[PDB]
């Protein structure tokens, strides 16, 4: 029942906050549209398990 | 502003009438003193490995 920015604001950044300590990352992402729904991706370094 | 009802009588009432409204600080439990005068500051602490 909200739009992007609420949930940007409030859910995105709070959780993106906490992959930055995760290891054999490669890059992270994360978008929220008008849907009311949020997905984040971390993608890690080929071979990774 | 914001109105609150008096049982007393039924007079309308305003916030300010029974509490002071200020900007002030989510919590009072800590301070820093940077060389002998007030400052803020923050500790990082490393992830595992």
Known sequence: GATAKTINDSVV???ERELSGVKNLLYYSATTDT????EITATFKPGTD | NISL???TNGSVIKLSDV???EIGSQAYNFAILENGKPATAAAIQLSPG
């Open chain 1, 35 to 38: 849907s009311g729904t949020a």
């Open chain 1, 13 to 15: 950044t709070l959780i």
């Open chain 2, 19 to 21: 509490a002071n409204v």
């Open chain 2, 5 to 7: 009802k008096s049982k």
